[PDB]
């Protein structure tokens, strides 16, 4: 694949998306536009298919009936030019090989690393920007609405949310909508309080692989509730949420030990 022209054609297109990220500090990419990029990176058509089913095997906690999830820590390592699964750092809800060995999921990680690489952003004082590594915390999350966070940043450098599917979800333009604000919006606000003068744009995932990427230090955001289409049945929404930041600055530090039982490491560049 290091010799495959479609690989480099895909990188060219991703470099164009990266220029737009630089300029706007966020991008929304339609899932139909992500598919050829991910294929070019090495995703198989069977793994794109399997991506739409992996959310069925997320962990169910009875103390959290409105969400099912798995999560894992990855490292974008720009010395080795690769991304690898890291050991658990504070367990039955770890991301499994089913997701992390999926080549389309791996393509998504490569996609994000390629875009965020080299992009100058606001530096959070608690983080170490002289490092050559990033920590990416990935959540595979199914939310469940049975018949509320306000405006915020996630405390990282780059956030990516990729839609995998949903069930009984209304697309009524107020359902699971991500609002994007400039920094002058009040970090507490709900929708009764958000000011139009501070709203940049409004996005809604609806189709497989719809992807939103945002500079978390330079936007604030909020996400409206999932609305059920058939109000009598449950609605679910399946997402991959990637939280990527530089390591914690030393004088609680991040462990960069690879995972022992669930190892994984894909090249970033070929």
Which residues from 197-216 bind a second copy, rule CB under 8 A?
197-202
Q: In sequence order, what are the beta bridge partners of 138?
A: 72, 242
Q: Indicate whether 187 belongs to the interface with a second copy (CB under 8 A).
A: no
- CA-to-CA distance for 72 and 138, rounded, in angstroms? 5
Query: What is the C-alpha separation between 260 and 249, in angstroms, rounded?
Result: 25
- Whichever of 95 and 266 has its CB closer to a second copy, that residue is 266
For residues 15 to 34, the per-residue mask of contacts with a second copy, x marking binding by CB under 8 A and - elsewhere, is xx-xxx--x------x-x--
Quick one: angle between helices 31-41 and 5-24, nearest 10? 130
In the complex, the smallest distance separating the C-beta of residue 60 from a second copy, rounded to whole angstroms, is 31
What pairs with residue 240 in β-bridges?
140, 162
User: Which residues inside 150-189 make contact with Fe ion, applying CB under 5 A?
Assistant: 154
The radius of gyration of the chain from alpha carbons, rounded to an integer in Å, stands at 18
Known binding residue 77? Answer is no
Cα(95)–Cα(71) distance, integer angstroms: 5
Minimum CB separation of residue 196 from a second copy in Å reads 5
Work out how close the CB of 83 gets to a second copy at its nearest, in angstroms, rounded to a whole number. 17
Structural contact between residues 72 and 136, judged by C-beta atoms closer than 8 angstroms: no
Task: Out of 60, 89, 129, 191, name the contact with a second copy by CB under 8 A.
Answer: 191
Smallest separation (angstroms) from a second copy to the CB of 14: 8
158 assigned to a ligand binding site:
no
* Residues 104/100/13/213 CA torsion (nearest 10 deg): 120
Task: Tell me which residues touch a second copy (CB under 8 A).
Answer: 2-9, 11-13, 15-16, 18-20, 23, 30, 32, 117-118, 172-174, 177, 179, 182, 184, 191-192, 194-202, 224, 269
């Amino acid at each position: 694949r290091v010799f495959n022209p479609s690989y480099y054609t895909a990188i060219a297109e991703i470099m164009k998306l990266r220029s737009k990220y630089i300029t706007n500090r966020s991008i929304f990419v339609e899932g139909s536009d992500m598919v050829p990029l991910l294929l070019g990176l090495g995703a198989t058509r069977a793994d794109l298919d399997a991506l739409q089913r992996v959310s069925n095997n997320l962990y169910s906690d009875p103390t959290l009936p409105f969400r099912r999830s798995r999560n894992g820590r990855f490292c974008f390592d720009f010395s080795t030019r690769s991304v690898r699964r890291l050991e658990f750092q504070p367990v039955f809800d770890e991301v499994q090989d089913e997701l992390q060995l999926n080549t389309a999921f791996q393509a998504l990680l490569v996609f994000k690393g390629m875009i965020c690489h080299g992009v100058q952003t606001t530096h959070r004082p608690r983080l170490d920007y002289s490092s050559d590594k990033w920590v990416c915390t990935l959540f595979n999350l199914r939310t469940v609405t049975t018949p509320l966070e306000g405006v915020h940043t996630d405390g990282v450098d780059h956030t990516m949310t990729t839609y995998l599917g949903s069930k009984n979800m209304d697309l009524a333009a107020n359902s699971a909508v991500t609002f994007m604000h400039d920094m002058n919006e009040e970090t507490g606000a709900k929708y009764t309080e958000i000011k139009p003068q501070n709203l940049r744009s409004r996005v809604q995932h609806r189709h497989f692989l719809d992807t939103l990427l945002l500079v978390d230090t330079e936007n604030k955001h909020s996400l409206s509730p999932v609305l059920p289409l058939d109000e009598t049945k449950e609605a679910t929404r399946d997402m991959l949420i990637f939280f990527t930041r530089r390591p914690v600055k030393k004088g609680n530090i991040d462990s960069f030990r690879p995972h022992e039982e669930l190892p994984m490491e894909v090249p970033l560049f070929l």
